[PDB]
Amino acid sequence: AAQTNAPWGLARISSTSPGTSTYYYDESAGQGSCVYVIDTGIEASHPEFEGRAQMVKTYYYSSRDGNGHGTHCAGTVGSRTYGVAKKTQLFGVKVLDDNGSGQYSTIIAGMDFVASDKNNRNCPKGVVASLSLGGGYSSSVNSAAARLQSSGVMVAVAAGNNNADARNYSPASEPSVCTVGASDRYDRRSSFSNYGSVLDIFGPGTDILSTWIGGSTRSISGTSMATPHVAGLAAYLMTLGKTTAASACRYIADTANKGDLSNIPFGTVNLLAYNNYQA
Ligand SMILES: [Ca+2]
Ligand SMILES: [Ca+2]
């Protein structure tokens, strides 16, 4: 399949080179996979989700995404137009309030929730969790992300937007999950992207067009935007049977575009998520 005039990030993950416009992807499109978007919620009624999104848990008064961030991330995972895995099932877990903030205890509870809830869902091709959030280092947050990964979920987490070593941020610093840095359309590390040895992979994160609340769309930037590219890619690859939740991060790193990025500090991987699609 080929989506013409795709958002640059989708084109980028299906190209060895920057600057293309078509997103090439296998038509399976993550069908049969599930991605939990642990964030401010998902506006599941957005037409771009095609009924494939649903809220499954909120830690606030409403399950509504009153912010947009979660909806945006979910759209990069799996919306029709803006998504990597256009046929995946999206499950929203609202751990962040409508200002985009959440207490670590709530974020931890949301991860534990996904680890259990997935056992109630039909996800024959596997389960991914996309965590476009983070704060300062917390062993308990890291442990929750590790538990979620151990439970059989492909956990992708944002490296953070501090232009600093992700070692000091969580869940970015949890080694066992897939810690995602951000790149821009010119294959530069995004100016805000964290870096460091704990990063596993980069994905498109600067000027990412996706869904927004109110049935809208907008372009925003962050490692929060790169993370769902990787989560979606994992779902897509898991549906193709190329990898499993436990190995998807390594598989994505092994199959990434290598050395394409600039402004990567020594000791940080120079790996950009790539679907290796061949028509
Ligand atoms: Ca290249
Ligand atoms: Ca890792």
> Where are the chain's structural domains?
2-272
How far apart are alpha carbons 29 and 140 in whole angstroms?
Answer: 34
Residue 198, exposed/middle/buried by CB under 10 A (0-12, 13-18, 19+)? buried
How far apart are alpha carbons 266 and 274 in whole angstroms?
Answer: 22
- From the list 138, 151, 170, 224, the catalytic residue is 224
Q: How many residues does this entry show for the chain?
A: 279
> In the structure encoding, which two tokens stand for residue 138, read together?
């917390």
Is residue 228 part of an annotated ligand binding site? no
Long-range contacts of 246-252 (CB under 8 A, 24+ apart): 246/149, 246/152, 246/154, 248/128, 248/154, 248/178, 249/154, 249/156, 249/177, 249/178, 249/200, 249/201, 252/178, 252/200, 252/201
Least Cα distance to 181 among 258, 268, 116 occurs for 268
- CA atoms within 13 A of residue 126's CA, in its CB half-sphere: 28
The answer to whether the CB of 12 falls within 8 A of the CB of 272 is yes
Is residue 177 part of an annotated ligand binding site? yes
Ligand 1 centre to CA of 153 (Å) is 29
How far apart are alpha carbons 164 and 172 in whole angstroms?
Answer: 12
How far apart are alpha carbons 44 and 65 in whole angstroms?
Answer: 9
How far apart are alpha carbons 52 and 86 in whole angstroms?
Answer: 9
Q: Is 39 a catalytic residue?
A: yes
The bound ligand whose nearest atom lies closest to the alpha carbon of 257 is 1
Ligand 2 centre to CA of 253 (Å) is 10
Q: Which phi and psi (to 5°) does residue 158 adopt?
A: -75, 140
Is residue 7 part of an annotated ligand binding site? no
Write out the residues surrounding ion ligand 1, Cβ under 5 A.
16-17, 257, 260
- From the list 39, 65, 97, 165, the catalytic residue is 39
Measure Cα distances from 65 to 54, 73, 220 in Å.
Answer: 12, 12, 16
Q: Is 224 a catalytic residue?
A: yes
- Solving technique for this entry? electron diffraction
- At how many Å resolution was this determined? 1.5
Residue 112 CB partners (closer than 8 Å, separation 6+): 144, 147, 148
Is residue 207 part of an annotated ligand binding site? no
User: Top-level CATH class of 2-272?
Assistant: alpha beta
How far apart are alpha carbons 176 and 206 in whole angstroms?
Answer: 25
> In the structure encoding, which two tokens stand for residue 163, read together?
């232009």
Is residue 230 part of an annotated ligand binding site? no
Least Cα distance to 181 among 146, 227, 129 occurs for 227
